[PDB]
Amino acid sequence: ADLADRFAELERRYDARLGVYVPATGTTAAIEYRADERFAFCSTFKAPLVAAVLHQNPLTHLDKLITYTSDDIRSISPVAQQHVQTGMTIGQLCDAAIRYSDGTAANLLLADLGGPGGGTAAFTGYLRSLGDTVSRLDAEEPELNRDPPGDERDTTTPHAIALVLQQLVLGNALPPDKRALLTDWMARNTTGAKRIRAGFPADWKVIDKTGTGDYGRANDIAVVWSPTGVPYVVAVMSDRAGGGYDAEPREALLAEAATCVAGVLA
């Protein structure tokens, strides 16, 4: 049979490169397919960005109002344009950056992180405090979805991002109150219904953060719980460089790969 042969069949069917990592657990072996190849973050980074901001500041910091203007509003931003008059709090921005992939919100949080490159260095720094020596962020939104294939900037690997998300949600990288805020935002995500959620049976709990870009880029990083409460971490990333910048991302690919994963964890 063999799970690798199946991921390769998915690649051929969807004409795409697929990366899958599920960290090991006390009872299950790691699941790997191109787990160490680089793929663009796209929006998957907005999840550990929220953790970085939570980590560097006391809970009271979520109450801080942030003001911005229309020139600040770039990339997909369903929440931010409805609050240019009023501004948004760090907390509301965290909510928006995760549940709606609001790109403007991802940029303000990067700005809040501080330093050179709009926050990208501080952020990459934050990933390093978690052992992730591979991932890097260099541009803000949207330039960060546009890097060409082979360019290492604004990339991670399934193996890397899985191990980060595991530390954040199931590990002790954040104290419980902050861990709970992060976990909840990912739990009430609105952008991921046709990706990893779609591939796992309904009676498995699924929290996630999606990513989409050019070159057929489609990602979903998730924490799932079996019907009897057993957690796993699942990172699935894809692109379709064969078709150029205008290549269509295929969400069914991520969902199918997730069903293959579910079958192996079952």
Residue numbers in the entry: 28 to 83, 86 to 145, 145A, 145B, 145C, 145D, 146 to 291
Please quote the authors directly:
Given that earlier BlaC crystal structures were for a truncated version of the enzyme that lacked the first 40 amino acids, we decided to crystallize the full-length version of the enzyme. Crystals were present in the P21 space group, and diffraction data to 2.8 Å resolution were used to solve the final structure with molecular replacement methods and the structure of the truncated BlaC enzyme. Despite the inclusion of the authentic N-terminal residues, the overall structure of full-length BlaC is very similar to the previously solved structure for truncated BlaC, a monomer containing an α domain and an α/β domain. Previous sequence alignment of BlaC with other known class A β-lactamases revealed that the region 102IRSISP107 of M. tuberculosis BlaC, which harbors the I105F substitution, is quite different from other class A β-lactamases. Whereas most other class A β-lactamases have either tyrosine or histidine with their aromatic side chains covering the entrance to the active site, Ile105 at the same position makes BlaC’s active site 3 Å wider than other class A β-lactamases. Interestingly, our I105F substitution reintroduces an aromatic side chain in this position. While we were unable to solve the structure for BlaC(I105F), the structural impact of this substitution in the context of the neighboring BlaC residues was investigated by modeling the I105F substitution in the wt BlaC structure. Specifically, we found that the measured distance from Ile105 to a nearby active site residue was 6.7 Å whereas the distance from the modeled Phe105 mutation to the same nearby residue was 10.3 Å, signifying a significant increase in the opening of the mutant enzyme’s active site compared to the parental enzyme. Further structural alignment of the computationally modeled I105F mutant with both wt BlaC and TEM-1 Bla revealed that the mutant’s active site more closely resembles that of TEM-1 Bla, with the Phe105 mutation aligning closely with an active site Tyr residue of TEM-1 Bla. While this structural model is insufficient to unequivocally establish how this mutation improves catalytic efficiency, it suggests that Ile105 of BlaC may function as a ‘gatekeeper’ residue that regulates substrate accessibility to the enzyme active site.
In line with this proposal, the genome of M. tuberculosis harbors a chromosomal class A (Ambler) β-lactamase encoded by blaC. The efficiency with which BlaC thwarts β-lactam chemotherapy stems from its ability to hydrolyze penicillin, cephalosporin, and carbapenem classes of β-lactams. BlaC is a 307-amino-acid protein that bears an N-terminal Tat signal peptide and is natively exported by the Tat pathway in mycobacteria. When blaC was deleted from M. tuberculosis, the resulting cells exhibited increased susceptibility to β-lactam antibiotics by 8- to 256-fold, thereby linking BlaC with the intrinsic resistance to β-lactam chemotherapy.
